[PDB]
Amino acid sequence: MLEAKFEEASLFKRIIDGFKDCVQLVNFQCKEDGIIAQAVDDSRVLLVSLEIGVEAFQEYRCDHPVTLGMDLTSLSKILRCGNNTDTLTLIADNTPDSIILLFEDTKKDRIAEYSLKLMDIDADFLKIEELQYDSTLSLPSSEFSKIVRDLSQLSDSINIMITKETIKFVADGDIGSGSVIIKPFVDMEHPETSIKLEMDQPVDLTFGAKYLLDIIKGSSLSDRVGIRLSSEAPALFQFDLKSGFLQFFLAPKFNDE
């Protein structure tokens, strides 16, 4: 049995919204530590990882690590019914065949109990080993989302060039090209919009624009994005939470000759 109580249902609503347009079916593994969810894209090009710790819930309960196979469209449909000022409670009984979502109003006594049927997801559990990267920076989510939205209008391929402590976003399409140059800077009175960058090797990668849009669609869980590059490894696009995180493992293009 599991009974997890959220602070605001909108938090889970945004979590589900962030990675709903890239993957469709997710295995949610619930352990005494919290909730972990990893999902491979239908093209097996973008991996989505999500961790929510025990401190992100008003009340948490777990008697055994349990797997929940959820479809993101149905989950979004269920969570759209709730409002911003309701407490969300996820309930699972023994032999899990469905999951109960309780929306409880704090100013009234109205209760909305929804049921979601689980899915059978025959996906293997893989290990996301953490290895030191060559470049790791942090810049506001809104700016990165704007750059992706402007650059996706030219081509579907985006070249990331971190060289000489300069960040270059290149989009070479059929009609012209577009280049964005960013220089990291530390601005004192609000560090929120600052760009904290550590560059060791200059890295040249290329990614897909559609996956970039799917990644920036989750620009509502944090203010900045932890962006980590690696020349032989997929890049990490991370949105930190109060007690968890949402990572996107994006495999780069083939850097032919």
Partner: protein, 614 residues
């Protein structure tokens, strides 16, 4: 009425049935022959041991028997051969006994293999969950490796080599084709009947060569936008699962690439808006192997893939390969099964192993043993009712045996109308094309071939009138059954018999397209010259052109290169053009064909005329 012969008494013999046998039907006779292990071939060859001779047997059958000096036997001869031959066949008999022993030994060997895998799985389960009996015999007994694939060994090997040398060809930009001929095409198509193992073989070679599998059903996702979203971004990107699963040990350096398996390619849409052309263009530029699997290859929608990629045909599996597999699944599911029916199982399923496995799984629940006794109701209730190809429709419709009294009783007129309705867009065309190219066998007493062909053509004209009344306004589609008999059934019945030469495909489509192109060209010419002709299209074609040729082309032949100015003046008087001049000479036929006359003109004159036009 047939005596119970000893088991496998006909083992080792090759028997061909000819003519019509008044006691047993030809199919029943063939099944009874296979019942005692006799090999049945439709054609008389040097390896034939006994030919059963019936009435109305084809004359060239008899000529072949005479040249080969093969013993000819009647119904009482077959009676005695069944009755008197010793059991188990008593020099081919020992060879076929060795073959049967080898098949049984292989069946036992893979049965032990399967039970050992089951024991290993149970041990693994004990160490640490779909139940075995919950899976179909199709998926439980699916091939786990290429050595269990039955039939199409050559195609499987060709696909394996093409996939293996893919990186080597990519390093040379696909310029070097090699000895096998695979390496210039970056994409592979697999086409054949359903249920033969094309998808299974593709997945097996994908997983064995270390390529990360990417599968997407073409019928499930059939859209240009969807194709761009899910494939374009997948054409030149590495894989996340390939890197995270294993990258430390030296397995292979191509594990970060993708092998894109597109099944049900024929299930997409057609036209420019369809994704078929998008995938055809995908097959031209890609950095990852692209394997396509389809059931129907030669389709108008599938035309772009005809030359772009490398084609592989998976054919109907041979019976001998399938016998071992069915023996294995029979010993493992403990239901008795003799091999003598396996051939007849293959013949009625039209080589679809998935359907054979499904039939075995569905029928063995009630009849724990299947024998030669009940095989008739097994085959009669599981016949493959598939629409025949237009060539087979034409071959069957023009068969002289079908319109005989026995044929009419067996293959009734309703079956003829259904055969027409299998493909009603091409059956009248093929029938009209190749009805006068068959040697008749149903001529009435006092009727020649010319009379029968004349009546057939009269009925063809009636059928064409009906077809026009159908495919015009008021949509008289309920007249389709009428067009069944007037266009195809009756003309074929008039000239039914044997096929003299080959069944040529209908040429009316090509002539129609050529006539339409020529009519368009004549339309352009007439609308260019209307300023001077003031004559209709047909009136300018019939009369103006024989003079236009003489005004334009004859001075080149009779005066040399000094007549260019006069021809240019004549053509500018009627607003004629270079392309129009080229099209004018292509309209004449018969004793005046310019296809060689222009070549006889000196090239200097042509160059000067082109320069003057420019």
């Amino acid at each position: 009425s047939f005596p119970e012969g000893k088991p496998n008494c006909l083992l080792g013999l090759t028997i061909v049935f000819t003519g019509v046998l008044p006691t047993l039907e030809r199919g029943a006779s063939e099944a009874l022959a296979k019942r005692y292990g006799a090999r049945v071939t439709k054609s008389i060859s040097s390896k034939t041991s006994v030919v059963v001779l019936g009435d109305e047997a084809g004359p060239k059958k008899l000529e072949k028997i005479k040249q080969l000096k093969i013993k000819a036997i009647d119904e009482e001869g077959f009676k005695q051969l069944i009755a008197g031959m010793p059991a188990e066949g008593g020099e081919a008999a020992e060879k076929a006994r060795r073959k049967l022993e080898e098949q049984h030994n292989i069946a036992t060997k893979e049965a032990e293999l399967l039970v050992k895998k089951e024991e290993e799985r149970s041990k693994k389960l004990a160490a640490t969950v779909v139940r075995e009996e919950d899976k179909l015999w199709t998926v439980k007994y699916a091939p786990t490796n290429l050595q269990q694939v039955c039939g199409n060994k050559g195609s499987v090997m060709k696909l394996k080599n093409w996939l293996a040398n893919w990186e080597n060809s990519k390093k040379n930009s696909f310029k070097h084709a090699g000895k096998d001929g695979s390496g210039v095409f970056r994409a592979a198509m697999l086409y054949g009947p359903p249920g033969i193992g094309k998808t299974t073989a593709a997945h097996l070679v994908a997983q064995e060569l270390g390529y990360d599998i990417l599968e997407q059903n073409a019928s499930d996702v059939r859209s240009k936008t969807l194709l761009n979203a899910g494939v374009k971004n997948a054409l030149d990107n590495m894989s996340v699962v390939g890197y995270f699963k294993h990258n430390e040990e030296a397995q292979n350096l191509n594990g970060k690439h993708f092998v894109i398996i597109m099944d049900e390619v024929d299930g997409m849409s057609g036209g420019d808006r369809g994704g078929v052309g998008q995938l055809a263009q995908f097959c031209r530029k890609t950095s990852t192997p692209l394997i396509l699997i389809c059931n129907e290859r030669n389709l108008p929608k599938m035309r772009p893939f005809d030359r772009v990629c490398l084609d592989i045909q998976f054919r109907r599996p041979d019976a001998n390969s399938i016998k071992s597999r069915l023996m294995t699944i029979a010993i493992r599911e403990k239901f008795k099964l003799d091999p003598n029916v396996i051939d007849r199982l293959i013949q009625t399923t039209r080589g679809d192993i998935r359907q054979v496995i499904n039939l075995l799984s569905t029928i063995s629940t009630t009849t724990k043993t299947i024998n030669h006794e009940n095989i008739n109701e097994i085959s009669k209730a599981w016949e493959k009712n598939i629409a025949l190809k237009p060539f087979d429709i034409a071959h069957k419709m023009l068969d002289g045996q079908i319109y005989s009294d026995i044929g009419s009783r067996n293959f009734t007129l309703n079956d003829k109308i259904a055969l027409y309705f299998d493909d009603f867009d091409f059956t009248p065309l093929m029938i009209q094309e190749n009805y006068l190219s068959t040697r008749p066998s149903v001529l009435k007493p006092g009727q020649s071939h010319l009379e029968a062909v004349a009546e057939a053509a009269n009925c063809i004209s009636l059928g064409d009138i009906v077809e026009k009344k159908i495919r015009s306004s008021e949509q008289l589609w309920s007249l389709l059954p009428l067009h069944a008999v007037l266009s195809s059934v009756y003309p074929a019945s008039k000239v039914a018999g044997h096929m003299a030469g080959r069944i040529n495909f209908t040429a009316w489509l090509g002539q129609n397209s050529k006539s339409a192109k020529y009519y368009r060209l004549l339309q352009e010419i007439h609308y260019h010259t209307r300023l001077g002709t003031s004559t209709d299209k047909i009136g300018l074609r019939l009369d103006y052109l024989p003079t236009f040729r003489k005004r334009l082309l004859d001075p080149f032949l009779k005066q040399g290169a000094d007549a260019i100015s006069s021809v240019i003046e004549v053509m500018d008087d009627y607003y004629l053009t270079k392309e129009d001049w080229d099209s004018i000479m292509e309209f004449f036929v018969g004793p005046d064909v310019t296809t060689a006359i222009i070549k006889k003109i000196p090239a200097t004159v042509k160059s000067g005329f082109t320069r003057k036009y420019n």
